[PDB]
Amino acid sequence: GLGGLERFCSPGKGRGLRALQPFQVGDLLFSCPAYAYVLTVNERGNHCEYCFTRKEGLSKCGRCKQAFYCNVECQKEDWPMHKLECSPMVVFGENWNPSETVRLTARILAKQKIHPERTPSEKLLAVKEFESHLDKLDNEKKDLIQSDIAALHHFYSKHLGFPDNDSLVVLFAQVNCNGATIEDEELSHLGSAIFPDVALMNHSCCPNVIVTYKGTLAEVRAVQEIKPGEEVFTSYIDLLYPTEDRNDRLRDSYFFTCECQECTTKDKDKAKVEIRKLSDPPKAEAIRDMVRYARNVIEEFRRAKHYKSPSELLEICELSQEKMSSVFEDSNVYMLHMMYQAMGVCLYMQDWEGALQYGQKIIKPYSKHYPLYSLNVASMWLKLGRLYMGLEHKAAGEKALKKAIAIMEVAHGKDHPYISEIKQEIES
Ligand SMILES: Nc1ncnc2c1ncn2[C@@H]1O[C@H](CSCC[C@H](N)C(=O)O)[C@@H](O)[C@H]1O
Ligand SMILES: [Zn+2]
Ligand SMILES: [Zn+2]
Ligand SMILES: [Zn+2]
């Protein structure tokens, strides 16, 4: 398996990963090549399909004209997977729209068909041993999975010999509980992948490691000191939100309730739900009313941004901030949430000054709500630094970039290509 590590049975968590030797903050616990992976549609042309390297002047697949490569070698290496989509993409035309989960599952089945034996990605845990939580799925969940299976048959029937329906349901549930989004240095979505050895790690809201990505390779580095015998815990979710929100998401997606220190004590929750200390104290029921409102408007915005204009979205953020502010301080995570969304739609609108203005009032609370080494914090420092540099505020830009580097050296490793790029952006 992996030196200095050991698969074991973690009480109340099923199987987990334990350390057999000490690891210091920044040490590399291990690296894991992707078992199967797929680049998200919106990043085609920016990244190489095979190795995920970002560069300009990628070779275009002459066949489908929708898959870009470093060279003919990367193209050849990606052909066993790319042929699943090359011709269907041109035949279906505009009707080709499988969800990313379907694309990934199709590549999983292909990888099992050609490489049925244990891969180097499965040193400690094989794909077939994945947890499915089949018995927990309600009818709504089952019907969503059945819709994905229907799409799988619809777009990938010519190249894959499919197992029976039951097995496909198990596979999709396993993907939903073990899949891994790949994000860039600004936590922008690059694609989805299966990292069997990485999936073994259980969740904690105070994790001791962070998973970063070097192309299609997952790397796992410590963000706290790990001693022999201690279990290795990563985070599955955004840690910004209070305990009940986190466990709502964990129950919904992974079907378990977390009992880590943050969940048991809920101490940071008080900072996260900051109430204005005004002459008139809000009553508890008014607080809970505004909290419910906040959680509702967050979901409403997730929906609205698919069919609404950017300015309409900014209006939603501005109006919700005013209403919520009557009760919530600006450091409240629901205010920060709407500020972050406003920053994103301003970034899309290319209003760099506006987005910078929002980002400035986001990093101060962000830094304290998130753990010491957090990719969310690093990415915010990086976005800020790049806006500063773009608007020629070099002094403040360099400051922000160094803060990002300080966290990334730990999480990504000091020799990571991203850090080289950022140091170039300081010297240029
Ligand atoms: N902190 C935690 N408490 C209880 N169960 C957890 C947990 N973190 C992860 N899990 C379990 O692990 C699943 C994710 S895959 C992680 C490995 C899994 N424990 C296994 O034996 O294969 C979750 O769906 C949940 O069932
Ligand atoms: Zn490449
Ligand atoms: Zn093609
Ligand atoms: Zn927790």
Residue numbers in the entry: 5 to 432
Quoted passage from the original study:
We have determined four crystal structures of SMYD2, including a wild-type protein structure in complex with a PARP1 peptide, a wild-type protein structure in complex with an ethylene glycol polymer (PEG), and two structures of SMYD2 mutants.
L351A/W356A is a secondary-binding-site mutation that targets both subsites M and L, while F184A targets the target lysine access channel at the active site. The F184A mutant was also crystallized with the PARP1 peptide, but no peptide is found in either the substrate binding site or the secondary binding site, suggesting that this mutation also disrupts binding at both sites. Phe184, together with the two other aromatic residues Tyr240 and Tyr258, forms the target lysine access channel. Mutating Phe184 to the smaller alanine (F184A) widens this channel significantly. In the wild-type structure, the target lysine fits snugly within the channel. The mutation likely disrupts this precise fit, leading to the loss of binding. The results showed that the peptide binds in a 2:1 ratio with the wild-type protein, which changes to 1:1 with the F184A mutation. In contrast, the F184A mutation at the target lysine access channel abolishes the methyltransferase activity of SMYD2 on all tested substrates, even though these substrates, except for the PARP1 peptide, can still bind to the mutant.
